[PDB]
Amino acid sequence: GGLSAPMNGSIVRVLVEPGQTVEAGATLVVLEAMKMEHSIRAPHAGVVKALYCSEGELVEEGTPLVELD
């Protein structure tokens, strides 16, 4: 599963690559709303099965950002 943009904002760095094996909260996608960076980590250690948020993608509150498997 995932958190996918815990809030609404603008992505500036999408670390964990499509496919990789996470750790224990690896900031998978780093969001930024109102001059403040909101890195959404990973609450249940596994692998990343597909991320849809190429840096800049100014998604919304709910949008699908990254998903385990």
Binding site: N8, G9, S10, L58, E60
Partner: protein
């Protein structure tokens, strides 16, 4: 009371009279015209661009909200005159006091035509000086909100500090707390800054399909987590009238919303708390316009102030305290349109006895709860070796304590010059008079033009004297040149009213008429007892 009369000594037909009167009226027409240009707002250009959107003009919203034919005392209209780079009419906010449902109220409205209605530094300062007169004189407040935000380019002089924007909300909530109703009428955009004037107010009104209260308008909102929304959607009139609750009355348009506002001030159950022994209002005994000629055209030309008094008091009856003592300062009792007042007017220099006389008077007024009226035309304190050795220092101190401590209502009118310690000893701007006004002929400054260029240049050739040299009339003269003019320029009324060191420049012949209005307006608020500090004997 036929002894308390002031028999004039002025000849209205005299040539000298007409001469003075001449230049004076000219000065008044000088102001008449500029105030006219200021009524223009952001210029017929955007102004018409305004009425286009179906929005009533700021100055007209007021005339409509007022009581039929009620008077209106405008505050600092020369606000921001040639101060900021551009022209920013009456600082982009019109404010004044006027009857609304039989209650004298404080109205504050923005000119969305002036640089977008945004808050320039002075704008904020003007909005706040209104709130002071409001809290100081107990006038309920009607905010006719229609502003962009705060002038982003100059934020550093508009956002942080104590006296900045935000002190606007501080005063609002304190007034609401001290039972001085806070009303708000939203008739345009109200982005972030101004979003609070309506959120923090006893009662709030919005014009549908026109008003918008939101912490972040579409600009900022898209610049946050993307999202693109219309204004009406984000924070429209219907969103805060039926949805959230940031507003209270849903108005159909400018006219409606003002009508709704009227009605709010109607169920206020308001009662005035001041209270004096006002008496039968009787007019002067000399036409108030005659003043034009009483005042010399020669700024440093000596005239008797008793003559300006006989043209403002009722029945020209004035009873003078310490009649013939330190005559440099006239002190006396009389009434103004009923309301009894204690007067303190300059008649020249100001030796030590002038202060004692003045301090002692203020003690009698403060004891009887009689409003204080100051008429400034002070050139300074008499100096010298003996005069300083006599305590012209400590005695002058006596006067200031009394003045700063007086809790009755204080009123000041500049009818000559405020120079040096004088301004302070005669209830100047820093002594919180309810209102302070300036005549067209008056000039204010720390000390004369060449008076300061004197010392300032004198030292330069005192440091270079014990420095093995002398100052040649060559640099000394290029040393006093720019100061001599700087003073001339920053001593003029417009430069003063532009910065709010006064609640405006007035028509010398209207004096009596403005003082009556002010007094009454300050009677909505209790006359508090007075507590004196220590007196340097």
């Amino acid at each position: 009371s036929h002894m308390a009369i002031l028999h004039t000594q002025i000849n209205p037909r005299s040539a000298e009279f007409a001469a003075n009167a001449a230049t004076m009226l000219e000065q008044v027409n000088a102001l008449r015209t500029l105030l006219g240009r200021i009524h223009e707002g952001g210029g017929s250009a955007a102004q018409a661009r305004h009425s286009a959107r179906g929005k009533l003009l700021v100055r007209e919203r007021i005339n409509r909200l007022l009581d039929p034919g009620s008077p209106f005392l405008e505050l600092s209209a020369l606000a921001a005159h040639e101060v900021y780079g551009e022209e920013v009419a009456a600082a982009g906010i019109v404010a004044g006091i006027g009857r609304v449902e039989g209650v004298e109220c404080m109205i504050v409205g923005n000119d969305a035509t002036v640089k977008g209605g945004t808050y320039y530094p002075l704008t904020v300062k003007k909005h706040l000086r209104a709130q002071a007169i409001a809290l100081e004189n107990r006038l309920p407040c009607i905010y006719l909100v229609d502003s962009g935000g705060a002038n982003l380019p100059r934020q550093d002089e508009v956002f942080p500090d104590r006296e900045h924007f935000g002190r606007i909300f501080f005063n609002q909530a304190n007034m609401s707390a001290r039972g001085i109703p806070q009303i708000a009428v939203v008739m345009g955009s109200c982005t972030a800054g101004g979003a609070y004037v309506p959120a923090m107010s006893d009662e709030t009104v919005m014009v549908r399909e026109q008003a918008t209260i939101f912490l972040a308008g579409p600009p900022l909102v898209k610049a946050a987590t993307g999202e693109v929304v219309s204004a009406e959607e984000l924070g429209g009139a219907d969103v805060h009238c039926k949805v959230s609750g940031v507003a209270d009355h849903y108005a159909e348009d400018d006219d409606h919303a003002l009508a709704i506002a009227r009605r709010c001030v109607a169920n206020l159950n308001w009662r005035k708390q001041g209270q004096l022994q006002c008496r039968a209002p009787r007019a002067p005994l000399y036409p108030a316009e005659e003043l034009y000629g009483v005042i010399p055209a020669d700024s440093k030309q000596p005239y008797d102030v008793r003559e300006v008094i006989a043209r403002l008091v009722d029945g020209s009856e004035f009873d003078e305290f310490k009649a013939l003592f330190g005559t440099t300062l006239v002190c006396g009792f009389a009434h103004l349109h009923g309301y009894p007042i204690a007067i303190l007017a300059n008649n020249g220099i100001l030796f030590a006895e002038a202060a004692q006389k003045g301090a002692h008077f203020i003690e009698l007024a403060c004891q009887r709860g009689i409003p204080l009226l100051f008429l400034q035309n002070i050139t300074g304190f008499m100096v010298g070796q003996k005069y300083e050795a006599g305590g012209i220092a400590k005695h002058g101190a006596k006067l200031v304590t009394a003045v700063a401590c007086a809790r009755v209502p204080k009123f000041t009118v500049l009818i000559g010059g405020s120079f040096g310690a004088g301004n302070y000893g005669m209830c100047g701007r820093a002594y919180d008079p309810r209102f302070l006004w300036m005549w067209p002929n008056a000039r204010i400054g720390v000390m004369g033009g060449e008076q300061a260029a004197g010392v300032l240049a004198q030292v330069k050739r005192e440091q270079a004297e014990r420095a093995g040299q002398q100052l040649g009339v060559e640099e000394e003269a290029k040393i006093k040149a720019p100061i001599l003019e700087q003073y001339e320029h920053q001593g003029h009324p417009y430069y003063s009213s532009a910065r709010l060191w006064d609640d405006g420049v007035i028509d010398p012949a209207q004096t009596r008429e403005v003082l009556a209005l002010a007094l009454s307006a300050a009677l909505n608020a209790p006359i508090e007892p007075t507590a004196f500090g220590v007196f340097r004997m």
